[PDB]
Amino acid sequence: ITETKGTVLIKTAEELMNFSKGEENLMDAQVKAIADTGANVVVTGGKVAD
Amino acid sequence: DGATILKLLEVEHPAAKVLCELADLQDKEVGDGTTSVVIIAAELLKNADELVKQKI
Amino acid sequence: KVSNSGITRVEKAKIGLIQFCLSAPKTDMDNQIVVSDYAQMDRVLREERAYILNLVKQIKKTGCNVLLIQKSILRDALSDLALHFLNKMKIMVIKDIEREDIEFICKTIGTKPVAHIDQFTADMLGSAELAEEVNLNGSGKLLKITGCASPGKT
Amino acid sequence: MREIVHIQAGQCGNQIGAKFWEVISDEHGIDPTGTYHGDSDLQLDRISVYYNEATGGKYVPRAILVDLEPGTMDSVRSGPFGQIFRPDNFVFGQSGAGNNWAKGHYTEGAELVDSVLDVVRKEAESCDCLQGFQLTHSLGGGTGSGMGTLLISKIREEYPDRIMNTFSVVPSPKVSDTVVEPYNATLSVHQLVENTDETYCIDNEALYDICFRTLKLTTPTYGDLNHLVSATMSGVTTCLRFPGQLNADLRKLAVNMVPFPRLHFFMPGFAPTFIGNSTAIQELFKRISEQFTAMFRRKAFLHWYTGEGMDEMEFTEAESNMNDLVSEYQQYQDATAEEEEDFGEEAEEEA
Amino acid sequence: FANMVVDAVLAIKYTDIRGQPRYPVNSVNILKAHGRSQMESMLISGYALNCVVGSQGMPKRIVNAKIACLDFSLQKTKMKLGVQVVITDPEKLDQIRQRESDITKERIQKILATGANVILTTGGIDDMCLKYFVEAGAMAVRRVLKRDLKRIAKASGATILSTLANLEGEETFEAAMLGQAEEVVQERICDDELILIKNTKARTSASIILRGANDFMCDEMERSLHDALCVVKRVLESKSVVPGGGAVEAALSIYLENYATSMGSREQLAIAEFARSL
Amino acid sequence: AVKTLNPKAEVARAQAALAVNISAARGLQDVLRTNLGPKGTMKMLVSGAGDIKLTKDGNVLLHEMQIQHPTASLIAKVATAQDDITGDGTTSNVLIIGELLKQADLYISEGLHPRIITEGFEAAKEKALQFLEEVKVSREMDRETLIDVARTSLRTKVHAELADVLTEAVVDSILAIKKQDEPIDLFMIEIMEMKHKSETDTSLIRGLVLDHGARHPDMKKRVEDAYILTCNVSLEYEKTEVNSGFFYKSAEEREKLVKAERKFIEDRVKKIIELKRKVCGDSDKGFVVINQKGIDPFSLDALSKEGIVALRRAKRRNMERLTLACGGVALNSFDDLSPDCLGHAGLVYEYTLGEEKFTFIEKCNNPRSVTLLIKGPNKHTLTQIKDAVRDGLRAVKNAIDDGCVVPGAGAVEVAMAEALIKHKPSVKGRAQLGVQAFADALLIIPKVLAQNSGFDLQETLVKIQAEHSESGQLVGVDLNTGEPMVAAEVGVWDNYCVKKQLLHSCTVIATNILLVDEIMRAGMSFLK
Amino acid sequence: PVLVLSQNTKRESGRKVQSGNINAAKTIADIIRTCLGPKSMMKMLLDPMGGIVMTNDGNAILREIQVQHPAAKSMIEISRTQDEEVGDGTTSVIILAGEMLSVAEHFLEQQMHPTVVISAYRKALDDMISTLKKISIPVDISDSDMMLNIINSSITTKAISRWSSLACNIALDAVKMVQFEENGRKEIDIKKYARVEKIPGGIIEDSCVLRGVMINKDVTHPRMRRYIKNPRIVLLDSSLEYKKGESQTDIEITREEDFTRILQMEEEYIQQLCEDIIQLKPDVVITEKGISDLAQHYLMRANITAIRRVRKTDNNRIARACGARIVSRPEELREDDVGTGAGLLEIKKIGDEYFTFITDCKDPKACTILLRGASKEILSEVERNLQDAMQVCRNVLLDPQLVPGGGASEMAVAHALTEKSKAMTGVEQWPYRAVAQALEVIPRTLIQNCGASTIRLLTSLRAKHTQENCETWGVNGETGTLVDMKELGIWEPLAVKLQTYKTAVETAVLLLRIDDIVSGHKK
Ligand SMILES: Nc1ncnc2c1ncn2[C@@H]1O[C@H](COP(=O)(O)OP(=O)(O)O)[C@@H](O)[C@H]1O
Ligand SMILES: Nc1ncnc2c1ncn2[C@@H]1O[C@H](COP(=O)(O)OP(=O)(O)O)[C@@H](O)[C@H]1O
Ligand SMILES: Nc1ncnc2c1ncn2[C@@H]1O[C@H](COP(=O)(O)OP(=O)(O)O)[C@@H](O)[C@H]1O
């Protein structure tokens, strides 16, 4: 996320419906891109999200 | 100055606070003679009590 | 005491009682003004001045000499700009009238309370022969209104 | 991650910091030897903001301890939780200021501020990206106020756009421990105004009147007052130290809390924490100025400052800007304007 | 001191409806400054301010003084509580920040375009605004007490302004609301400084400066002088005087002791005691 | 008198104040007299915390003894003022003050007013200054004379073996940072200390040593031929001065803004990388960045991916020193970056000592700034060596700044005493007595020296005065035979400004002390 | 219970109050009377902060003492009023007040009312003033030798007399450099433009007065020049950096390019600011606020030297010296506000510390005084002595009159009053003479400090003043003989004597009117 304070500002209903699906799709794309290189184990020094 | 002296002192007997406020009133209304009025009032009170000790 | 600086005698006084505020606009609902360009900063001040001046001119149009303003503890009932304008029109201003003696005042001098500028008409005013502040020698000041054309039973 | 270093100056500052760090360490599982024996790793998500990790597993606080007299460091080292600090972070002189603002700001401070600035450089070199400073001091002393203010100015020069917060104690209304307290307080507020983002004014008598009546049992010394102040500071900084439903550093509180830059003084509270921009500050300053003038009109104790290098007009400028601050605070209420001076003369004629 | 007091009281007589004249004492300022002997106390035909000039770059003597009295602070403008600034286009930021520093300037010029030399203010004056007075060659005094401003404005013929707005939408400053004084000086007295305004033209005014050995002495003299001022005021207002030293008490005692005989009751004793107590 | 007004006051009247002052001055000199000379003894000082300090310096000893006296405070302040200007001569000052007061008391106790002795002091001071103005020796100030002066000033703090090591370093550094004008500027000699490798390894480096290293694991530890870039521009995440916040719509906008918020620093890093590629085309030379502000892990990663060594938060004064040593330009912005701004260094490397890191910059062309590297096994050892180094540097600088140097070992004091004894017949009145007193005080410097070497004061002093009376050679004490020796030929040299300042200060303070009538403590006990 | 009327107030009345007041005044006078004349001895005092004051000045002694009796407080206050009004004579006023109060209890104990004594003292003060004005001597202020003589005669009593010919010169120069006439006809010798800087070390003979000013500052960046020959100086009251406003400003951004854009505009701001300075082509920039690093970069590119965080007082003195004026907005900077009256700017090291000198001014109206010496206490005493000397010089410049010293004026006035008193009748004749004979305590004290026979010297001097023209005879305070002040050359300004007599007599009048004391009345 951004270092400066950031807020998700919505003005219509469709954005409100689509936000969570957008986040989930982005996270899936990132994980699959990492996995496609052949890595079997990931080691991190911070929090892991659900 | 009678008013200043009586204002700077601390008093608690009501019969003396009456005279202190008398001096303050004399200062406010006129601005002079704030020492003579206390003397006059005290002497009047004393001479009246001398009569009231007799059955007057 | 009178908030006006200079006027202490009114002969043939016309008196009105006010229950609204001569200040900047403020809706009972949460309001705020957003500025995003440099012209709006001057425009806000100009419109504020015009808004106050309009109310003062409306008050003057009816012939009022003495104004009574009831106490308000949520918004300012009389700002410096309004007081300056009222002084420029030779109107004596008295503020901070308690909320519990309004009935006595209305019964005495025959005023009718006004809670809206649209209802400030020449028929809601009372008439008195003299309105003036007196100064006791050292104990302070006082304000007397005497010679009411329509006297109540007080 | 966005580290903060903490600076303590003076006897009162040292006493408060020694308990602030004690009450922080028990929250994160640190031991008086520096090791860690906590259970929940939620304590380690934001541990690096206040502790620097050394080789071998120890954690050392990001703290610098400063005073002009070696009396208080000996107590701090000999006291509880006084052996986790870095031994090279103790800076002290040999004489002391003796409750003189001028000596702290001009004579004795100038030959020691360089050591503090050389220690903060090494403490800042070890953090990836610092975000600000914490300062604890007093307004009624010589080392706490004058030297602390000089240090604030120097830090502001060296570090341009980093945040700065202070936790300053203030003189009490009906009791003044020092004869020259108004002078020190007035001369320190002048440069607290323009060199800090927020100030957390703490009063001694107000918090002192809680142990007798609310705590139901005390005849105490500075002791538990200090512990209560430390608890207040921990309740303030829990947002920085811990993650929650909505975490926010002190800047993210200030931006919502400070609309106008120069009105940045607060009054705390505690209900087991409350922080408020109550304008009851305007009552405190109105008192201090009231004392200042009363002494300055008589030129009392002035030669003790003039001999150190200060000029007579510095007091005049300080009091002028104190009056400016008081008027700026007063212009926000429009209700205290009703209490104008009662008119005494009788000239109320034509106009 | 009797001559000083009589002159000071006569200098304050005001012109009422003319039914009766009035003498508003305590409109004459009294200032204390220890130093020379008490015979060096001075009466000033004008007014004296316990204030100093705003900046050390200003002039400290004006020969023909045009005075403008103000009742508001000359500082860079800030929007009120209701108004706030929200920026979505960065290009519009800079022009905003200039305006805050320009509005107040546009006011000062309006005051200085009419030839005003001395400006008195009950509020503060920013250091950014002192430079305009410094360049124009003018004196500015800040943090003036309200009552002093009222007395100065009444004496010199000026008009007190809490704002520049007129009966239209705009702000103007006219030359008809300026007072005129024949001299304005900054004087030095025993290591401090104060301001003299001499020979005001609308009305006569007075002030007194009291010199003494130390502060206790000067305070006692001020308290003493107040009594004489009040006595002279009472004598002028009511045209009657009475002897002193005890003539009144003796005469009243004799008269009341004689008059008590006619009552012939128990009030006779009380009247006699009143006479003896006098 | 003051007791009737303040019952709690403390007073000391005419004959008691003088006794108090004399007693305290003698008490101070009785302790400080064991330091004088190369044969003085060493003191150990332990504070409340338990830290240990071994010392022989007069100023340190004065400021670390547990004393509460007013006139002791006066004398300590005088010693501090002498030290801060000259840096040498803080024991002789106290000794001469004490002896002057004792000699004055010797005559005052016989019914003589102190003003006569004061006038005698003034006349004797003028005569002594005139004599010192003609004893001095002017020379070229070559390397050998400076070696002699530095060694003389250093053998009184450390033993001979370490003094022979410190002398060369001090003289070489002072000669290295000197121009033929523009008087010598210290602060161009950095004193760094490392705790290992027993102190005979103290050295001089014609470069710089910095107490911090590279913060990325993938940076090169040794560079053989390097360009030096010195800057104080910030490569940290920076925010707008005015309040600001991000308002996005979904995840993709959030990502766009996240990558957008870094360009202001990526531009600076790209400027540095472009300059490095332009200058160091082939991977044969090096590039080193010394910064006074912070550097992010992102910027560290970007720089290290190219082969750049970067240091963050160097000290402010180094901003000058590097520019005088490496020979570049210290810059605040990157909008004009060019190859003239770069300096050159012939070796850059790193050394790890326990928990700490050091960086060495060496092999510069003509460095105008050098470093004195202190070494030793303890901490008090390093502190003592640091004090000795300060004394030596000040001595050499004062020798160069003046065009003259004065013979030592006490010869000049004997000469002044003999010259003053024959001047007192000319003056009139009882003031002669005062002159006599002054002369005797000037003999406190030779006596103590002899008494520190195990000889007898009076017979050795008589032997010294036997010469300089038949052969006018400037003769002083030989601290291993007790026989007179010609100080100049042996190689014992003293500074001229030190002696002049010492005479002035001692006379002024003794004169002001002798005229104190009564001591008063009648004010507020505490400022509370 | 405890029936009371005044809550533990303590009241005293009667003759005991008068005796106590007089005794307290005499006790105050007794502490000081050993410090009058050229043979005075010093006193060392300890303040509540641990310092030391080794001094000889009467006010410096009295203001360091805590006391309870109100009469002592009145005496201390009159001492400080004398110090503030004229700057000299704070010892003789205390002794004179003590003597005049001492010679009154003799009449108070002989059933004489205080008002008679008050009237007699007030009558005698006027004759004292007239006789003082009668024997005055005018002085020509364009003769430098006479002014040096007056200053020397003023400082032969203090500790810097050993360097008198030095100090005198210093003082004179300083005053002559601050006398200043401006709009109108108001002339001033204000002493807030003559700053005294003390640097321990060196020798006292190196003290001097600079034609310029001296500050404890250094260049902001090392590459700035430390030696400029004929600089042009601009003085700023503002900060050369980007700051926040006060109108509750916030920014909301949604586009990628805005953030960086904003961060650029700040820098652009700085640039134009610097340009508005470079358009005037100066060499030195002095500001009371901070300076940003980007501004330093631009100024160095323009070959400028910058200093930061100078005090307002120092900026005012620099403006008065070099001839510039202070500016707070660079956009309104003109050519008339650039100071071109300086002649050198140098930056030196004085004992491991950097100092900035602005010297060789064409015609400065402000100066600085640089003192060197053994330690802090000696320099503090030298500072006090220099203050005394400069105040005396200002007094003589504002009122060119002189009266003899050494006790000639006291004996002349006493003889005049004694001769005048034999033309009066009534009781007031006896107090009227008393004050006259109270003026002889000044010569007597001098004799006692010299170590001579007061009983014979005083009567010889009294016999000498009886003759027709011997108004200038006095006591030589160093040997103990009678000598004419014409040849010895001890003259003092008339203002000091007038103030001394007035303050002493008025203090006696004030203290003679008390009759009772009330204490502990809770404000
Ligand atoms: N010259 C005088 N001769 C006789 N009596 C006087 C004289 N002056 C004042 N008095 C008397 O003094 C009294 C006033 O005393 P004062 O101390 O002024 O106190 P106050 O007037 O406040 O009572 C008056 O009654 C007056 O008769
Ligand atoms: N080799 C030597 N032989 C004789 N005297 C010496 C020798 N070395 C130093 N001195 C004397 O020692 C004195 C200085 O002693 P020191 O302990 O350095 O104290 P300080 O220099 O602080 O007075 C000088 O007067 C010098 O003459
Ligand atoms: N050489 C002198 N011979 C005789 N009297 C002197 C001499 N010098 C000064 N005085 C006298 O000493 C007095 C000054 O006293 P001093 O001790 O300087 O303190 P102060 O000036 O505060 O009284 C003057 O009245 C002067 O007449």
Ligand SMILES: [Mg+2]
């Ligand atoms: Mg009366």
Ligand SMILES: [Mg+2]
């Ligand atoms: Mg030595």
Ligand SMILES: [Mg+2]
């Ligand atoms: Mg004198």
